[PDB]
């Protein structure tokens, strides 16, 4: 399968942005367990969301997971300047993980 994301989005401080995560097979479900890794500058990775909505320990509460239509999503309510990072997602199929291209979020 091929997981797809937006190439690059733009937002500002205080605004509400929404990223998506399509699947080529069909629609993204609870079985896919949608994950969302964050890559800040200088290769600093950290898991934000996983299992469609469950945050990791210590992750800001503004990062919320949902299922908007036929794709998984990551809504950042009140975008900070530190959020400027590449947001990959990852869907499970038959016990194998498939990453996406990533979404370069730029905060003005």
């Amino acid at each position: 399968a091929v997981v797809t994301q937006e190439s690059a989005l733009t937002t500002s401080p205080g605004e509400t942005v929404t990223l998506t995560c399509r699947s080529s097979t069909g629609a993204v479900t609870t079985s896919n367990y949608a994950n969302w890794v964050q890559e800040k500058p200088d290769h600093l990775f950290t898991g934000l969301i996983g299992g469609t909505n469950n945050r990791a320990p210590g992750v800001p509460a503004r990062f919320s997971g949902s299922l908007i239509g036929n794709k998984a999503a990551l809504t950042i309510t009140g975008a900070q300047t530190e959020d400027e990072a590449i947001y990959f997602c990852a869907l499970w199929y038959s016990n194998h993980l498939v990453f996406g291209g990533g979404t370069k979020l730029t905060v003005l």
Binding site: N35, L44, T46, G47
Partner: peptide, 22 residues
């Protein structure tokens, strides 16, 4: 390539949390 090692919580749900520097 730069190979990382991530950690996963599997109990009840699947989410990443702590990654390496690579």
């Amino acid at each position: 390539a730069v190979y990382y090692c991530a950690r996963m919580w599997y109990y009840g749900t699947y989410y990443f949390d702590y990654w390496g520097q690579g």
